[model samples]
Target: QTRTYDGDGYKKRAACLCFRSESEEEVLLVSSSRHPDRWIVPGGGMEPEEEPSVAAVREVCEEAGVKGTLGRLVGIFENQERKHRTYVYVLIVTEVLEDWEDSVNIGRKREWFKIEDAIKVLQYHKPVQASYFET
Candidate 1:
């Protein structure tokens, strides 16, 4: 006899990278090009046999026009129900160029908000918000 799980059993790996502006002390938040209701970091699932760091950078570029360099690892989280694991990394923004128009067609929104404001608006996800404001 073989055992089978009743609920949806899918496993996924995702990375979330936080980029800080060098000129200003604010963080970037994007209304996912796919989903508007949830504002999230600029990262997504890692491809098979692909490095996490590489995936992080790639996601940032695809989701946001800005290019950045990955820094130290921030945190790792897991979603049991979704069978997904998320790795968080800190990325430093070396150069930022306005390319909001690109996101318009993708059903995404981008905005730069102060760290404090982000902390407030992103309170729903305490872990993510704390990554920026928490000591």
Candidate 2:
């Protein structure tokens, strides 16, 4: 299901935060407290004055314990039934730190998975946001 947001008519923007290491071609995903066993790519709302890429990198760092070099603009993910619009980004994760400043107590656990694994899980939970991951 989609995450929290403001009241009706208020648009929401987000991203599917990604990361890569020199050894493997994979992305990172975090578990939500809502369903601690399920997974989701790090993401959240766009900033009031920040651009898509910048906002993406920050989210990843906050949600996951890492810093990444911003990559391509994956694309805009839209929920046709809702007013939420998300800008998906593929960030090449740089450093995965030991500690992070995130909202983890609510259950955001970061981990990496092969692209295929991520695909399998994304479709089931976040179908709309999953569109960008296929490519």
Candidate 2: residue 122 lDDT (0-100): 77
The numbered model that scores best in lDDT is 2
Error of 2 at 81 (Å): 3.9
User: Roughly what TM-score does model 2 have, to 2 decimal places?
Assistant: 0.81
Q: Write the per-residue lDDT of candidate 1 for residues 15-108, one digit (tens) a residue.
A: 5445565443677777754557756666667776667677767767667666776677666665554555556667777766665444755756
Tens-digit lDDT track of model 2 for 1-135 = 234444664455666456576443688888865787888777777766677677677777778877766767878777767677777877777788865766434546777888778778878877775566667
Pairs in clash, predicted candidate 1: none
Count of steric clashes across candidates, in order: 0, 0
Alpha-carbon RMSD of each model: 6.2, 4.0
CA deviation > 4 Å runs, candidate 1? 1-16, 22-24, 33-38, 97-104, 125-135
Task: Tell me model 1's lDDT, rounded to 2 decimals.
Answer: 0.61
